[PDB]
């Protein structure tokens, strides 16, 4: 979280938290209810968000869903949307934690090696995530949509 990150840096330098570290915990916790609302809205529309990401993806890359494509077929496509459902879930976790610790250990560290083995094209997974940003972001107020958007762009960043 913001808490975990602050503390780990504190303990590693053998010291109490800084004024800065204390301030960010305070600003973070003040945004608690708002962050919880952002996760709720997105949890509430999860099934819609994945199908609109999935449509946006297959237009932009009809090949992935083509003879020599990693997601070619009905059940190679079913698993692909399931992976898109996984990442949206992790994005809700990140938003309520206020950093990526959880998102990272669960779904980016090791992701290159996993997908290389499965021979999944990584950069088109990054596209599927942009597609989810676009849908999710259209169900949130301007301010909340930006706050959510940072976590989408992080995942897009880590698959790189």
């Amino acid at each position: 979280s913001v808490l975990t990150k602050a503390i780990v840096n504190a303990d590693a330098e053998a010291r109490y938290l800084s004024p800065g570290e204390l301030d960010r915990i305070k600003s973070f916790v003040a945004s608690g209810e708002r962050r919880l609302r952002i996760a709720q809205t997105l949890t509430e529309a999860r099934e819609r968000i994945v199908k609109q990401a999935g449509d946006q993806l297959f237009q932009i890359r009809p090949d992935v869903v083509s003879p020599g494509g990693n997601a070619y077929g009905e059940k190679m496509t079913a698993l692909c949307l399931r992976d898109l459902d996984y990442y949206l879930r992790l994005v809700t976790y990140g938003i309520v934690a206020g950093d990526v610790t959880p998102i990272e250990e669960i779904g980016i560290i090791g992701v290159k090696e996993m997908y290389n083995s499965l021979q999944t094209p990584i950069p088109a997974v990054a596209e599927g995530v942009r597609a989810m940003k676009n849908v999710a972001t259209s169900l949130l107020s301007g301010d909340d949509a930006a706050e959510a958007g940072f976590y989408f762009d992080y995942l897009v960043g880590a698959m790189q």
Binding site: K5, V8, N9, A12, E13, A14, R15, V100, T101, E104, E105, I109
Partner: protein, 96 residues
């Protein structure tokens, strides 16, 4: 990653950089990032901080002034007196 412990690297110039600031500036700033590096050396090499007599100044003075690197500050600490004493002397040779 975040799955392991922090790594402190002294990028912050140090060096007693100087500037275009008041000659006897009070706040100075960022000669306090070195100071946390200095205590973190102790925390790896001995695991805790030492007591008052014990700390090795004049190794720090030089690190802080920019004359020697991090690498050589570790060397001075490693080859020091209390390091020998705490960790070499009382144990069987290969345990040490």
């Amino acid at each position: 990653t975040t799955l392991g412990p922090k790594i402190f690297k002294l990028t912050q110039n140090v060096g007693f950089r100087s500037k275009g600031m008041v000659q006897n500036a009070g706040v100075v700033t960022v000669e306090g990032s070195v100071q946390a590096l200095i205590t973190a050396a102790y925390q790896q090499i001995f695991g805790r901080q030492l007591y008052q007599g014990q700390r090795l100044k004049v190794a720090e003075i030089k690190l802080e002034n920019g004359e020697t690197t991090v690498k050589e500050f570790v060397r001075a600490l490693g080859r020091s007196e209390i390091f020998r004493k705490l960790y070499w002397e009382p144990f069987y040779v290969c345990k040490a």
